[PDB]
Amino acid sequence: TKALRHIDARLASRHEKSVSRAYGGVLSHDQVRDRVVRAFLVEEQRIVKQALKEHSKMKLSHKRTANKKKSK
Amino acid sequence: HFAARPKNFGIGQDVPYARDLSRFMRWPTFVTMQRKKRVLQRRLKVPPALNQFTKVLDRASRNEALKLIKKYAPETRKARRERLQKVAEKAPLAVVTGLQEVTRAIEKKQARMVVIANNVDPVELVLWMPNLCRANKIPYAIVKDMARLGDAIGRKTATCVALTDVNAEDEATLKNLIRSVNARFLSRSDVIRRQWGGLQLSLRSRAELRKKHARNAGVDAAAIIQ
Amino acid sequence: RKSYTRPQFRRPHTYRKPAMAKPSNRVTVESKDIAAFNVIRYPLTTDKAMKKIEENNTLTFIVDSRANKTEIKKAMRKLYQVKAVKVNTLIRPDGLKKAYIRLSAAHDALDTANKIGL
Amino acid sequence: GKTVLSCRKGNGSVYQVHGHKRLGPAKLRILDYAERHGYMRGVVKSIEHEAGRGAALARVEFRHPYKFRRVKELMVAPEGMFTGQSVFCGQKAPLAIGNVLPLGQITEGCIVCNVEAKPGDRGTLARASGDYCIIISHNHETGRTRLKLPSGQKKSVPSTSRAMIGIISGGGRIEKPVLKAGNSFYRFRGKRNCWPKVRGVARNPVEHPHGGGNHQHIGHPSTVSRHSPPGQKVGLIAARRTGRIRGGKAVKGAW
RNA sequence: CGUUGCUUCACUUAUCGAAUGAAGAGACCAAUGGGUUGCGUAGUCUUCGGGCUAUGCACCGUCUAGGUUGUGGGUACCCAACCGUG
RNA sequence: AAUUACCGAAUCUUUGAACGCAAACGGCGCAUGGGAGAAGCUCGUGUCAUCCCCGUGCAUGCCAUAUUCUCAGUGUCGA
RNA sequence: UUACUCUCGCGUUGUUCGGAGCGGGGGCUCAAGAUUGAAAAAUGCAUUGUGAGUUCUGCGCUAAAGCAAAAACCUGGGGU
RNA sequence: CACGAGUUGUUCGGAAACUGAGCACAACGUUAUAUCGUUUUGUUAGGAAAGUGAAGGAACUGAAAAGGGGCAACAGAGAACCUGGGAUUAUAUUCCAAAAAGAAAUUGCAUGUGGG
């Protein structure tokens, strides 16, 4: 990205103030990589935790029915 | 390919929809004051003279009385002009309207029934009329809204209406109405003159008191002998 | 009842009838053809003014001090049937406004000066 | 006579706060529904210095609870807070340095700062650098909490009031001698027009009760009544005692 | 029996302090409540139309999270009751 | 009558209570009615974008009014 | 990239830097200059090489003192 | 002292059009008396101060968005132009006329050409 003053920035082409990569002209290449990795890994941990909670509840209710059928 | 995409609306989580904020917004001053006035009037202790206007007549009797008044409503300007022109080339029997004329009718003991609105402001205009009617032994009723009386007689509002004479086609209706009115108002004079009003707690205070009584229950059982 | 979604009450939007045009309060008679005579007052004949006529095809006038360059161009066309390509103005130290008016090449300033009477 | 300087300062004029460089008031979050029932999580973005204040300030970013935007808060930073740290505020927040919790949820014997005297006041006690308050006890029947203040006094506050865990950053400031008049000049430049100080006995009788005389001396006792009018209440105001303190020092203030 | 002086305990509507862009109060978990915009019992009055004082039964008046009981695409409930209180 | 005297018809620049907004600025607006227009369009005419010029209305408060104008209120009713 | 194995290496006048990636090979980009030409000889008057000075710029950014704000403009995230 | 003359801008400075230390119109309150007080710590006033984007069949009609209207810097922010002249008695980055001595930059609105 070039360093342009007020009038120069307005009349210049869009290439000179940006980059084809995502968040171009706002974030550097290493900051983009950090956000991409963070988005995937944090979301994945939520999925693992979410499925763990449901199964623990799921296996708990099955035992109740099994205990119910055993008694009756 | 269509699927459901539910939104989580817990603390944090997704941005919620726009919920109703009527009960917590800042209203205009006159709105706030006209609500607080009713609250204060309920909370304070009301003397019998003011309290008597809170207890009103039954809906069916009110409807019958308004029907009779509308039947005997006074003439309009066009009707009066036409009648005057016809006689040129006395007004028919009607009700008595207007504070001065109604008061004169009551004082001269010409009225057979009196109807008084319960929401006149300032209230000093009609605060004494039930007492005057009781002293003269004249049947009277206190009904809801001066707007209904005004609509019955043909105007915007009306403070009081007096019935003095009625045809034979409605004499029996008038007698039944007099009986009902006397049952509600004139027979209960002692209770009306002795009964106070007000002293009403709010719903929140009532619920708080109930829960406090429920919580502090049975803690003194051990002090009872045997 | 109605539902409100903002924490404070604002004035509702109501119908507004537009205002009507009244009869004009000024009734003096004004003429359109007279206006150009007010803009241009009279020419100058000083030594500096005369040199510009021969060497720059330019005329010099005293004009209304509240007039602008655009109006002066139009008045010149309406009064003398010439086209002005450039107008420069200044306000003199005595309070009057002076204008150097350069004519187009199609016209001759000297010929126009003779018609005026310089 | 003429008006005394202490009374003249009450008009304002050239004796007001120099606040052009300041960043704004420092306060906690607004006590809202999320704070009363759950918790909110924010991120510390920067730690900065403000002219006239000895403690560091922190900028903390939260999400708006009702709209799509970000909210920035300026708070007094406890010691140890760092950029990128997560801050939890609310009823269900865990017990850690930097979090904001209701006083009823904090274990007895804990060290706190930025304490609300009244619920929703957004922090009024224990804010100067290096200061803190100590939790003494709870009363569940009355719903109140007892605190020991930096001055040594003890105060009872509603248990709904909030507090931040830790101590205020920047402690140890007053241990370094100043050594120069210019350093005091720069110190008070950021605060106000109150330095240097001229002694009362060095003035003339027209301006001060202590002025005048062929020697520099006060001719009457310097302890004055609580009922003295303005312009007469100078010196040691309503002093219970004077002189060097022997033995332990009592706790200052009213009963 | 009455009235009036001080007081201590409970309350909230005057008033005071604070905060907020007046941004989510309280209840539904039920009376020492309210209702003619209801039904009985016992007294006690009545201008005979019906009231008042105690006392019972209805109506206002209901909901709920959670807890207890070889790769791809899917299934794994309902109980009803207590605890809890959005 | 470039005489005088008096008076009924007229003109009356920028301001000022000054009142569209401001002001050591002959400055800047909204609505409406006009004017001029060497571009472009069209058959020396007509028409006209951007720019320019002129007239009128537009402060705050209060009173009356609306062939009966448009609305708000967990104020009081009613269906 | 066994670069710091047993005195590790690169670098400034200068107060230091490296497995959170030094040094070497090859590259991408920014800032300040240099060079070739159009302007431009048609103008002006009647030549291209070194030392000294010079705050534009670069060397990225005392303190209990830590160094204004906004209009205007630029880019992106979503959506069309 | 007398008479007669002289100051030329799309780009230079200001305004149109920024904000600062600050001021105080409206609003509210006070005073026998407004010629008094509050009025930037995001900000007036017990406080109903938003007047048009799209639309929808060519002018209408109304959704959205909390916190009234201004002023205060000719050294702060902002700002599209340069040289030559034999061009004055006195002005010039303001004057020069078809070989403009000439070479540029920029704003508004329209007409082709190309692409979509």
Ligand SMILES: [K+]
């Ligand atoms: K009311």
Ligand SMILES: [K+]
């Ligand atoms: K000083």
Ligand SMILES: [K+]
């Ligand atoms: K002395």
Ligand SMILES: [K+]
């Ligand atoms: K002395």
Ligand SMILES: [K+]
């Ligand atoms: K209503």
Ligand SMILES: [Mg+2]
């Ligand atoms: Mg000029």
Ligand SMILES: [Mg+2]
């Ligand atoms: Mg201040």
Ligand SMILES: [Mg+2]
């Ligand atoms: Mg002396």
Ligand SMILES: [Mg+2]
């Ligand atoms: Mg003295």
Ligand SMILES: [Mg+2]
């Ligand atoms: Mg001495």
Ligand SMILES: [Mg+2]
């Ligand atoms: Mg003394």
Ligand SMILES: [Mg+2]
């Ligand atoms: Mg004006």
Ligand SMILES: [Mg+2]
């Ligand atoms: Mg090494």
Ligand SMILES: [Mg+2]
């Ligand atoms: Mg002289």
Ligand SMILES: [Mg+2]
């Ligand atoms: Mg002279």
Ligand SMILES: [Mg+2]
């Ligand atoms: Mg203030």
